[PDB]
C-alpha cells in the first residue's frame, strides 16, 4: 500500500472530525485531561473507485491492512493514543470513510490567574506529515465534530467543542506538516470553593478581629496567632491543589494579602499592650477603636482593588 | 468474514448478558468503579448452520477469527475493556453462543447530596454500531444477567443488578447505534462515618459550649479557638475524600453550619468580656445564661431543618 | 486442538498446584495482595500417548500451541494473571505436565475487627469451565502445593499455605464450573503499633489527667484541649490506613472511647471552676480528688470490658 | 536481515536527530522527566539500492521488519521508549531515512544546591552497540535536532536543546559502544516560592519578634512557640517536595538557620522572665531592648553570608 | 529446538553476568528497587559447532527462535523482567554468547534497625530450572559482572556489585534448580536527616526544658504541651516514610524515648505547681533546680545507652 497518486499536483485532503464520548480527569496540577472519542477520517482514493451496478454492492468494507490510511497523530498527547478501528467504508467514486474509537491523555496548559472563577480552552491538535509522493493537508468536516449530551467533566461546565477550520501548514524537517486546532471551552464550577475555602478563611480572619474589643494581651495573642495557624492550613490546602505558576493567581493574591492583615493585627495588639504597661491607656484605646473600623474597611477596599486588577 | 445476510429486511438481534464476578475500587473523587464479569453474546448466523446427523456433532466450536462476531463496545469505560474469549459454540440452526470474561474501569456519575446516607445507580452501557449491510440491534437475555453471591464492593451494599430490556436506537456519525443500560443499585454503608467523623465533630463542638459556664475570657478564647482548629481538621479530612460538587452535600451543609456556631460563640465570648470590663457583669451573666439554652436548642432545630431539606 | 475425548462419560481431572515464590503488597485499604508463584497443571490426553521403547524418549516436550491446554482462570483477581509457560512434558501414557510462572493481584476481603491483633485467611480461587465435548473437574496435587522459605509479606507472619482438596462443583450459565480454594493463613505483626500509636496515645491521655492536680482553669483548659487535638491527629492517622468497615474495630473502639474521657474531663474542669468562682472550693476539691482515682479506674475497667468483647 | 557490508573497513555511521515535541512531568523527588519527540535515523544500506525507472517509484517505503534497522537505545531511560515508526524511506542509492515518534521517562540527576533559584542540564543519551560483522558509530545531523516553540515544562524555562556532536566511543563487554549526549538546559521559575513559602515564613518569624516589645512571659511563650509550630509546617511542606540530598540546599539552609533564631528567642524570653521574678527588671529591659535591634540585624547579615556562600 | 545432549551425564553450565546500567526508585516502605542492566549468558551447544575454514566466518549470528536458549528467570522480581535480546553469537566450537538488556522491579528486604545510619545488601537472584533431557547449573563469568560509573541511587552510596560465584543448587518439584546471588552493597546518605529531623526534634525538646527556669504553670503547660504536639508531627513524618518493622529502629527508639521525657516534664511542671499552691515553694524550687541538671544528663546518658545497643 502507497498513498493515492495526484490527478494534477494537488495535495491530498483528509477531512477530519472528533466526536467526544468522555471527558474525565482534568488534573489542574498536571495540566492534563483524559479523552475518549470517535475520530473520523475521509479522503478520496481513485484506485479504490468501483462501478456500483457491476459490483452490486453500494459500499465496500476494507480491513486497515488492505488499504492506504493516512498517519494522523495528536500533537499534545502524553503517549500515542489507544485506538481501535470501528469501520472503513469505500464509496463507488473511491471516497474512503474511516472511523476509530480512541482514548488519550492530553497535555493542555491552563490559565490559573482567575482561579477558581476561571474558564479554559482545552486543545486537541491533529497532525499529518506529508510523503515524498504527495503532500497531505487536513480539513474539518463540521458534520462529524461534536460531543454527546452526557459528557461531564467533574467540577467544570462544558461550553463548546469546535474546530479551527483553517489548518496550520508548516515545514518540519524538510517535509510538510498539516496541524488542526480542536478547542474545548470549559468554565470552572466555583460554587464548592465558597463553603469549603473562601467562607471558612473569612470567618477565621473575622474571629481574629474580635481582639479589637479586648484589652487582654494574653487572650489577643492567642486569638491572632491561633487564627494565623488556621489560615496557614488553608493556604497549604489551596497550594497543594494547584501547580506552581510564574504569575499570581486570584486566590493566591487574596491568601497572601490576608497574611499582611494578620501581621498588622499583631503590631496593633503589641502597640495596645506597650501603651497599657507605659501607664497611658488613653492612646491605646484610640488606636484600638480606630482599628475596629480601619481593619474591615481596608480589607473590603483592598479586595475591591484586587478583584478589579484580576477581572 | 462479513455480517450474516438478512432473510427478509429484519435487523440482526444480538442477545446480551452481563454476569458480575467482581466489583471493586468505587472511587468517589473519580466517580469510577472497576468491574470483572462475563459478557455473553448470542446471534443467528445461518451460514454456520449444519446437519447434526451427517456432521456427527450437536455443537461446533469456532475460534474468534474463524467467524463473524459483532463489535460490542462499552460506552462509559475509561479505556477499551480487557477481554479474553472463554467459548464460541454454534448450534445446528447456526445460533452462535459467544462468552468472554472482561475487566473494565467504568465512569459512572455519583450524587453526593445525601452523603454519607446516599444510594447510587451505577451504569454499564453496551453499544453496537450498525453496518451498511444491516441494522444490528441489542437485546437482553435475562437468563444470562446476574452477579455471584460473593460480589462485594467495600463500604457499599449491593441492592440489585438488572438491565433495561428496551435498547436506545439512535444515529451517530451516519450509522445507527443500539445502546443497553445495565444498572447496579448500591447504597453506602454509613456506619463508619458516625464514630470516625460525625460524633468526634459533635464532641469538639460541645466542648466549645463549656465556655458558657466560664467567666474567664483567656480560657474561653482557648476553648473556642482550639476546638475551631479541630473542626477545620475534620472539614479538610471530609473534603479530601469527596469530589468538588456544584451542589451542597448533607455532610458539607452540617460542617459549614457548625462554622457559624463557632463564629457566634466567639461573638458571645467577646460580648461577655466587654461587659465585664465595662463594670456591668449583670448584662454579661444574662447573655451567658441565655446562650446555655440558646446554642444547643438552635443547633438541634437547625439540624432538624437541614435533615428535612435533604431527606 | 480440541479437548481429549472421554473413554466412558467421566470428567477430565486437572490436578493443580500453586507454589508461592513471592507475597507482597498486602493493601489493607484495598483488601488486595500481590502473588508471584508457580502454577502446575496435570491431566491425561490419551491422544499424546507414545511407546517409550520405539520412541527412544521417556518424555516429549510440546509448545502451548501444539496441544490442548485447559483454560484455568483465577476467580478473585483484579485482571487476568501475567503468566509465562515454564515447561510442558508428556509421559508415554499421555499424562501432560504443564508448569507456568505467574503474577496476579488478588482481591481477598479482610476482617479488621481485632486490628492490629488480627489474623487473616487470604484466598486464591482456581476455576475451570467445562466444554461442550466433555466436563472438566479440578483436583489438588499436594506434592505441588507449597511456598519457599524466604516468602515474606511485610508486617505479616505467614502461618500456612494449604488447599481445600474437594472442589466446589456448580452450574454457571448452563455449564459446569470446578472451583478450588487455596488458603494463605497469616497474622499481623502488631509490635510496631505499640510504640507508634498505642503508647503515644496513652501518654497524651495521661498528660491530660494531670489537670486533676491543678486548680488553674486557664492551664487545665490548655492541657485537656491541646491533648484532645493530639488525639485527633492519631485518630486521623489510624483511619487513613484502614478501610471503612460496617463494624467497629478494636483500635477504632479504643480511639472513640478516649474521646468520651476527654469530653468528661472538660465537664470536670468546668465544674471545678464554676464551684471555685461560686465561693465554694470545698465541693470542687472533693470532685477533683475523686476524679484522680475515678478517671484511671474507669479507663482500666472500660478497656477490660472492650478487650473481653473483642477477644 | 544482518547489517550492511563495508566497502572498505570503515564503521557504519548512523546520523541521528531528536526533535522535542513535548516536555512534561519534571519530578524533583524522582529526578526524572518525560519526553515526547521525533527520533530520526539515517544510514546507507547499498543492498536496498534500486532503479527508479524499473521500480516505477523515486523513493521506496519499507516496513521496520522488512529491512535491517540499527538497534538504537537510550541509556538513561526507566524502561525502553514507547516508539511508533512514522516513516522508512529508501532512495535509489540505498540511503535509508527512518523516523519515529517516541515517549520515554528519562532519569537525569538534578543539583538542588541553589533551589528554588537553580538551573539544570537535562541529558538524553543515545547508544548503539557494534555488531559481529562491522562497528556502528553515531553522528548528529544538526538539520534534524530541535524543539517546537510551544514546548513547555511547567515551572521551568527552557533555555536550549543541543547535541554534543562528538560521540563517546568506548569498549563495553568486548564490543564497541557509540554514545551521544543530547542536552536540555532549563532554569526554575522561582516566582511562586516567594508568595507561597519565602514571604509567609518571614512573616511568622517577624510576628515572633513582637515578643521583644512585651514583658508578658505567658503571651511571649504563646507567640514564639506557636510561630515555631507554623515554621515546622513550612519546613515539612518544603522537604516533602524535595529529594534527600547529601548536601545542603539554599532553602534548606535558610529554613534550618531560622530554627536557631526561634531557639535563641525562647532563651531571651526565658532570661527576661527569670530576671523579672528575681526582682531585677533593669537587666531584663536592657537585654530585651538590645534583642529588638540584634535579632533583625543578625538575621539580615546571616542571610547575606548564606546567599554569598550559595551564589 | 531442544537442550544440548550430554557427552557423558554432566550438567550444562550457563555462565552468567549482570552489568548494571541504572539503579533507581529504592522504595523503603515497599522494600523494592528498580534496575536496568545487561544480562549475558554463555553455554556450549556442540550441535552449533562449525569449521571456520569451510563456512568462511569466525562467528555466527542467530535469532532467539533459531536456537535453544536457557530459560533464566529472576527469583525476587515483582513481575517477569522486560527484556530485549541485544545479540546472539556462536563461535566455531559451539560456544553461544547471548546478551539482552533488561529492566525489572526487584523485591529485596531491608534492615531498618540502624536507620538512617544503615547499610543494605540488595539481592538479584538468577535461577534456572532443569529440563527432562539435561540438568542446568549456573556459573559467574566475572569478566561480565559490573556497573557503569554514572550508576546513582538517590540518597544512597553504592559500595559494590559482586556475585556469589558458588550457586545455591536445590530440588524444587522433583527438578534441580540452580540459583545465583548478585549482591549490591549500598549505604544510606544520613546527612539530610540531621537538619531535617534530628536537630529540629532536639531543639523543640530543649525549648520544653526552659520550663525548668519558670514558676508560671500556665506558661509551662503551654511550653511542654505545644512542643509535644511538634514532636508528634515529627514522629508521624518519620513513620510515614518507613515500613512497619517487627523490631525497634534506632530513630524509632530515640523518638519513643523522647515521649517519656515530655511525660516526666509534665509530672515535674504539675509537682512544682501543686507545691506552690500548697504554700511550700521551698520544695518546688529544689525539685525544679534538680530537673535543670537531671533532664539533660539523663537524656545524654540514655542516648549513649541507645547508640551503644544499636551500633
Ligand atoms: C505588590 C507587587 C506584586 C507584583 C506581582 C505581579 C506578578 C503577576 O502576577 O503578574 C505579572 C504582571 C504583568 O502584567 P500582565 O501579566 O500582562 O497583567 C495584565 C493583564 N490582565 C489585565 C489580563 C491581568 O504584573 C502587573 O500587572 C504589574 C502591575 C500591577 C502591580 C500591582 C501591585 C499591587
Ligand atoms: C474574599 C472574597 C472573594 C470573593 C470573590 C468574588 C467573585 C469574583 O472575584 O468575581 C466574580 C466572578 C466573575 O467572573 P467572569 O464573569 O467570568 O469575569 C468577567 C469578565 N470581564 C472583565 C471581561 C467582563 O464570578 C461570579 O460572579 C461569582 C461570584 C461569587 C461571589 C463569592 C462570594 C464569596
Ligand atoms: C448531626 C446529626 C446527623 C444525623 C444524621 C441522621 C441520618 C439522616 O439524616 O438520614 C437518615 C437516612 C434516610 O435515607 P432515606 O430512607 O433514603 O430517606 C428518604 C425519605 N423520603 C422518601 C420520605 C423522602 O438513612 C437512614 O435511614 C439511616 C439512619 C442513620 C442514623 C444515623 C444517626 C447519627
Ligand atoms: C489501650 C489498651 C492497650 C492495648 C492492649 C493490648 C490488647 C491486647 O490485649 O492484645 C492481645 C494480643 C494477642 O491476641 P491473640 O492471642 O493473637 O488473639 C487470639 C486470642 N483468643 C483466641 C483467645 C481470643 O496481643 C498481645 O500479645 C498484647 C501485647 C501488647 C500489650 C500492649 C501494651 C500497650
Ligand atoms: C539524638 C541522637 C543524635 C544521633 C547520633 C548519631 C548516631 C550515631 O552515632 O550513629 C553511628 C553511625 C556510624 O555507624 P556505622 O558506619 O554503621 O559503623 C558501625 C561500627 N561498629 C559496629 C563497630 C560500632 O554514624 C555516625 O558516625 C554518626 C554521624 C552523625 C552524627 C549526627 C549527630 C546529630
Ligand atoms: C503542628 C506541627 C506541624 C504540622 C506539619 C503540617 C505540614 C503538612 C505537610 C504538607 C503535606 C502536603 O502534601 C504534599 O504537598 C505537596 C505540595 O506541592 C503536594 O505535591 C506533591 O506532588 C507530587 C505528586 O503527588 C509528589 O511527587 C510530591 O511529593 C509533592 O510535590 C502533595 O499533595 C503532597 O506530597
Ligand atoms: Cl491512523
Ligand atoms: Cl496520537
Ligand atoms: Cl466483541
Ligand atoms: Cl469496550
Ligand atoms: Cl491456562
Ligand atoms: Cl487469571
Ligand atoms: Cl531502533
Ligand atoms: Cl530506549
Ligand atoms: Cl532467557
Ligand atoms: Cl524474570
Ligand atoms: Cl533434575
Ligand atoms: Na493500512
Ligand atoms: Na470474527
Ligand atoms: Na455526529
Ligand atoms: Na493450546
Ligand atoms: Na529490521
Ligand atoms: Na529458543
Residue numbers in the entry:
A (entry chain C), B (entry chain D), C (entry chain E), D (entry chain B), E (entry chain A): 5 to 315
Please quote the paper that reports this structure:
For dicarboxylates, except for malonate, Asn152 from the complementary subunit contributes to the coordination of the second carboxylic group. For malonate, the molecule is too short to reach the Asn152 side chain and the second carboxylate is thus coordinated by Arg105.
Unlike the other pLGICs, GLIC displays a particular activation mechanism in which protons, rather than a sizable agonist, trigger ion-channel opening. Here, experimental evidence for carboxylate binding to GLIC is provided by solving its X-ray structures with a series of monocarboxylate and dicarboxylate derivatives, and two carboxylate-binding sites are described: (i) the ‘intersubunit’ site that partially overlaps the canonical pLGIC orthosteric site and (ii) the ‘intrasubunit’ vestibular site, which is only occupied by a subset of the described derivatives.
